[PDB]
Amino acid sequence: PVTINNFNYNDPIDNNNIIMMEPPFARGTGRYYKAFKITDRIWIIPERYTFGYKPEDFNKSSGIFNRDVCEYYDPDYLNTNDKKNIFLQTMIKLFNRIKSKPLGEKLLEMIINGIPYLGDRRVPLEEFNTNIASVTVNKLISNPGEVERKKGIFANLIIFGPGPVLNENETIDIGIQNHFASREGFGGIMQMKFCPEYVSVFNNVQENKGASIFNRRGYFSDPALILMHQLIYVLHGLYGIKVDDLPIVPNEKKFFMQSTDAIQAEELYTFGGQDPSIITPSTDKSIYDKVLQNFRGIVDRLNKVLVCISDPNININIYKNKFKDKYKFVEDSEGKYSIDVESFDKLYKSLMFGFTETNIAENYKIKTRASYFSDSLPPVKIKNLLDNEIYTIEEGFNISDKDMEKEYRGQNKAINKQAYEEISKEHLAVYKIQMCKSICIDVDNEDLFFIADKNSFSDDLSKNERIEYNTQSNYIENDFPINELILDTDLISKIELPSENTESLTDFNVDVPVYEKQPAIKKIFTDENTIFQYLYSQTFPLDIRDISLTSSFDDALLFSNKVYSFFSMDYIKTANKVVEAGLFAGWVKQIVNDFVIEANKSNTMDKIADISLIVPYIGLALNVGNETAKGNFENAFEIAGASILLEFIPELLIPVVGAFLLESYIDNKNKIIKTIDNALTKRNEKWSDMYGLIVAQWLSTVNTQFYTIKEGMYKALNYQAQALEEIIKYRYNIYSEKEKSNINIDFNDINSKLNEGINQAIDNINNFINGCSVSYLMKKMIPLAVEKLLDFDNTLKKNLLNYIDENKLYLIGSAEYEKSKVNKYLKTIMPFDLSIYTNDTSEILNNIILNLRYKDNNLIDLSGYGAKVEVYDGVELNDKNQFKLTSSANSKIRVTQNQNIIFNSVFLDFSVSFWIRIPKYKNDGIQNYIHNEYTIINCMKNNSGWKISIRGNRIIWTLIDINGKTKSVFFEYNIREDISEYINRWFFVTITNNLNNAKIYINGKLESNTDIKDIREVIANGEIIFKLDGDIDRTQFIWMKYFSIFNTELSQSNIEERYKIQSYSEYLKDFWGNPLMYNKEYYMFNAGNKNSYIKLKKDSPVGEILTRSKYNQNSKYINYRDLYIGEKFIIRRKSNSQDDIVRKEDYIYLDFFNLNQEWRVYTYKYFKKEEEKLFLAPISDSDEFYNTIQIKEYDEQPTYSCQLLFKKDEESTDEIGLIGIHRFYYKDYFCISKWYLKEVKRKPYNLKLGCNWQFIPKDEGWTE
């Protein structure tokens, strides 16, 4: 339904899609512009927006326009037809991207349909009018060499080029006589200034993703989301709901406060997230009421419009239907329009809480700022948007083909370094605060604190109420489900509008804004050493190469070559040291590890309700609050709580809730009852209105101060890392060339090792500060509010009880009942829930290859770094993620890792994990088994790297450095157990390496360790090979599953948890670990009697228990017990209504083969004992036995055992018993007992119970 046109700037004027226009702020003085119709009622004018700007304002100067942005000036942008045509082509591309999803199409559809009402507040209610600057625009028809001839048209949106600042965009409304039609329910033409080339940069300091090299490095915005964000402002203006009311005003009474203009509630609604929580519920109801009144005004006109004056071509009946659809009015048979609250409510919530930058970004999978108040960085230039290699319509920068979709790598400044260009600091203007002592330093106004003033919150709670028999508890929720909005769009219905052509405009009355610059520097005097001073001390000029760390704040602040440091004395002492060429390569590794250990120090909290851990060096780094740098930070915290960190304790506004006034009905008994009920419900409304008022004050005064502290710490840590590298780089250049050639250090490895440590430190600081912030709300703001609510409750109780008595005569037989109800009702409190106001609700972190994920008879890497996988025809695969490697030459897999990321060579932080199944040794081929060793996985270049090998009975992990030195660590499983937990069975492996130790885990349990301190450097890269390599028999093979590689050392907890997630399955497993199946022969094995099996008696229908045989003619080194012995069972479907996989809680038959027939296992319907033997007889049906079983899994930890339960009937709740083995002493019997039913419910589950069973099918990996 939405169509985008195509143009070139040099096309001739056709007076249908290319015209000469006179925009609204031209006041009809001439100077026509050339315009293009991108779509119905939308136009584009590729020019600079010059209205109300001085001609000289296009050049950078000492001045500034805005106080909360870095401003870029460029007076040559869009000054030639070639450049001017580039503007149109990019605009058409962005519109095509917007309409690529249903949500974007609905936004465009609403803008086109939202025609402005043909009227204004100055028009009589009985007519339309079109000579208004907010409805019509003139176009030129006459040729250049002819007398002027003009014509009028309807429009909705006009888009211009940027004004004097290129990185700031706006939407402007049209005001006549100081009144705006867009704030009074009518709507009007909207204008927008836009620039798609220079974009904003942000950061995600508050997002936790563990130790990552590229996390928290800066992101640039997608220009498509910038345009959409501005189109939401257009949608508000066209529907006339751009009302003004009480704004947010910053506090500016102290030198460390941030200065800004007032913020309107619409801006916070548009952004979405938890920002609308900063508008109190009192102001929410205020805005909702003004919008409703304006719509009531429009309905009155639609019932009274009869004539048109401006244009006789207007069909009133056609227009009336358009507006009826626009505002979703309702029509009756008689021909009268009206408002239904249900319809109006859905419309209002869609426009305000439906379309939001946070919802739009989520749907399109784009990254944006966390909050309206989050910090911003200098803008960048995008080199070329028209290049499909960089920016595509379907997925913008995050192109999946190039491996840029994962984690939004496409918008990451550090990674996608080819899509943008840094701006020259020459042209940027910033507002600065210059604070001189009694030395002087400069701080950007964006770096201070933001604290809302006491005037920004309403006090409507303290006004009186009138309660009547028909009073409703209105309450506006700040939410609208997104999916309901998407399903409401129609992609097939046509779009139809009246003709745009009409009479020319004659009245040009309009108000044009005026702009002026202001001085960009402010000077203050202060003697306090606060956060601003403590960060400037951790810097050095780029001209100085020789520096040294100090713990003396004053000393660092005095000498140009001395740098302050808040770490340990030990760390400072080591860093200043000087060593020889023989110890440089060891000193470097030592210090860099100390930096990572110095940061990442934490302590747990136990005695405070909300906080869980503390970081002890925050005080020394910043000295924010009540001189936190002095004494012990942790001790001061315990005695005072979070108050010590706040730089400013705010005064909290808490109104006194007003009194209720109850009406007096004479004789209506029912009406008296209803008024009491309405008062009680209305009371619960005041509780939520008070909680909303406190949360708003917390978000804009206390939570903002804590955010600034998180940014300070991130800035403070990077300053330390810069200083450390500069010290290292200096000591390297001092050595003579001869001596220097023997020092091998990779500066790139040094830089990334440090960045990984800083990310870990910031994660702890987030958890600590987030707890401190919430802890403050619960313990120092909410309790002060509950106290005055309880006062309101007491006062209401007196009012209600007195009300009942004065009407006692009318409440015959009910006064006693009401008095009881009021007493019970007003005794309880309504508890406070934070989840209403915030949006608050790890496995995959640090994964660089996720090889084994089966897809279409092939393996693929799901990691998202685009590793290439080659599988040769000799490899066997199945949809269970189980590939098999063999001794054949073509049984091989090859993985070529992307060059962009590889594990650090100097520090070796990485881990490996997989499942494996190693067949059994051959009985005769014992000697070959014990000696031969072969490789299975190899990653080695020039004989430097790692590999995994299986020596006889042993799994190994070796590591070879550039100088040929070798290490190793291995796991060894017993080969003498009667029943082995590893010999041909699936088990879980995980290997882990740091700079100190190598470890190996089996099923989540540490098994071995070795010291690797000596290893110099491992330089493996490029390729990985899966292949059996070595002296092997032709019959060797291996199964594998879920292979992966992590670029970080893993903890014991993660390994143990990963064991459970990959062990989980809805189906049951057999003895080997494979899925259990119907119609497949099995052997039985009891967990509690591992040495005994089942057999059918020679003369009776009862199974007897015998003893498992053991290996004979034993070679002394080997010992085991048989498994392929006894009766063969088989599981059969009972229904056949429904694949052969058996799932938990299935009803089955348990059959088995006797000679050449199939039998079944029965039980007597009634016995007078807890235990009784089971009945075995051929297939039949009778009323003497039960033959229905349900297969269960009571254990919650991973296992290969199942339990078998008899039942009377499928729909019955009766239980008969669980199958098991019992001793009637000294005989053992195949029995069913009621005793187990109590045991299986005791925690923890006992693995040794006599009711646990496993099924053993014949396998090629195990021989007799």
Place this chain on the structure above:
Amino acid sequence: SPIDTDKKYYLWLREIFRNYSFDITATQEINTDCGINKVVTWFGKALNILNTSDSFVEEFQNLGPISLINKKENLSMPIIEIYGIPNMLGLPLNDLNEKLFNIYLKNILYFKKVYFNFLDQWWTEYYSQYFDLICMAKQSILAQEKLIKQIIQNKLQDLFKADISMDKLNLMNLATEKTFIDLSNESQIAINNINDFLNKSAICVFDTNIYPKFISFMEQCINSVNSNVTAFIQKCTNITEDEKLQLIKLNTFMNIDFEFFDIQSIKDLITSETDLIKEEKESDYNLFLFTLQEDNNKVIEDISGKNTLVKYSDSISLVYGVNGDALYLKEPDESVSFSNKAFENGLTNSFSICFWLRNLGEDIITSKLIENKADNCGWEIYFENNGLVFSIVDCNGNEENIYLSDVISKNWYYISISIDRLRNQLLIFINDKLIANQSIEQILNIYSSNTISLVNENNPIYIEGLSILNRSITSEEVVNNYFSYLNNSYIRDISGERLEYNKTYELYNYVFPENSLYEVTENNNIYLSIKDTNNLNIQGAKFKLINIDANKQYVQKWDEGVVCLLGDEEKYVDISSENNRIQLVNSKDTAKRIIFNNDIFMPNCLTFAYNNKYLSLSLRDRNYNWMICNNNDNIPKAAHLWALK
């Protein structure tokens, strides 16, 4: 000023208990080459070991576990007698390998017996000194516990002389007596921390000190025997020269062959049977109700191991609830009682209670549900208005009356309540979400009966999974318990009950939870869609589920069936070919077979699948959102979740 009021005594007694628990249970986490270790912070000052510096934990890392014991080096090499040289007659062929292989096997065993010799030395000379520190550390904990009792005793004896009511003194004596039990429990936690801390230190000194020495000693003992095998095979003449190199390579010991060490296999040695009994008999439950219907028999009892007493009126029936059997209090004035000494709470105890609830009252009237109050002291839960109320009252008259709003009739709810005295925090959960987070700092003493009573007034009710814990719980435990219990093989209704074959229903879409599907005729065909925003008064269609196997009652996951609509004429669902809309047909032969399933994190919702394509709603079309066989990615994933009745 001196203590002269029972209220001031309660505040003093609470602060002593909280401070004592923080001091005695302090620990820190150290990452070692050897595993993860929990270090007892106060160990330094208790016995003056590494106590010469600022911090004990910092010194422990630098010097390691060996620094604790007194006699550091005590190992001694034993006497070795490896005469590895084979003792020459006959053997003219390469079948000599048979003789040589048996010699290779024995040399491995001899390496093992030496390994066992070192373990015995570690046990007798290195573990003994660690076990001594454990005994002394236990003696230290009990000594400090004995001192706190005296301080408390002295304060109470003095207060007995003051002017306080005889009855109030009696309660203060009872509250103090129950606190002594809490101190003993907290001391027992610290003793457990000491044990594992030093057991891991002892095991670890083997890995870093004893084991490396065993490597060096055996390293030389191999160079002495491997060469002795090379010398022998040159002497043998019958075999060819080329085979000499092969057999030498095939019977040579590297460092791997004698290397034996498993961190797990040594931990099994340290654990005795007495340790198994302790872990098999300790739990956090004072009450764990076990219900089991049986032929003409009910079984209701506590399997928690503290043997709570249960008394119930006959006529209490068992019925299937959410994941097993629930008590059904069908008729009025029915009751159940639980008797246990732990249910008298006092001043310092912390506990939790959780159960499933279903109410068939459908009336706005107050009613008692579950109570442990005696003389307006204690706690209870009861119905009010639509929701529930939780109450807790103090001996002095401090109260908390909290109102929970969500509860309505004929639904299943999961209620979980926690009381924490160390943090003075109260938590309440309904199903998945945290409802209340309160400070009970002002509540002081709560002393009540040893009996908890479950009752009815007129409302029939189901109860299931009633359980009581002796500790507080966290948000993570609640969420896991909730979803784990519902993860069974049954599909459920919108209200939480099991679905049934051959029962009427109404159909809702998760995206539009209050509009029901209704029939629409456009061409001769009949379709389904949700009602528009104006005609919501229309009555929804009525559906039924059918399985070929009659006598099947309840629907399970992965079952196949058809969908039937009630009316003057039977209709069945079929997929159109012209458009993928679902249309009704009047023939059971052409009815499609559909698969039923649900999602783990959406327990009461449902999905229909046809040939691995889900059925979902479509985008708006004039006034209709049709029910279709979807394959597009431009429709939200939520659109394919449905609910019945």
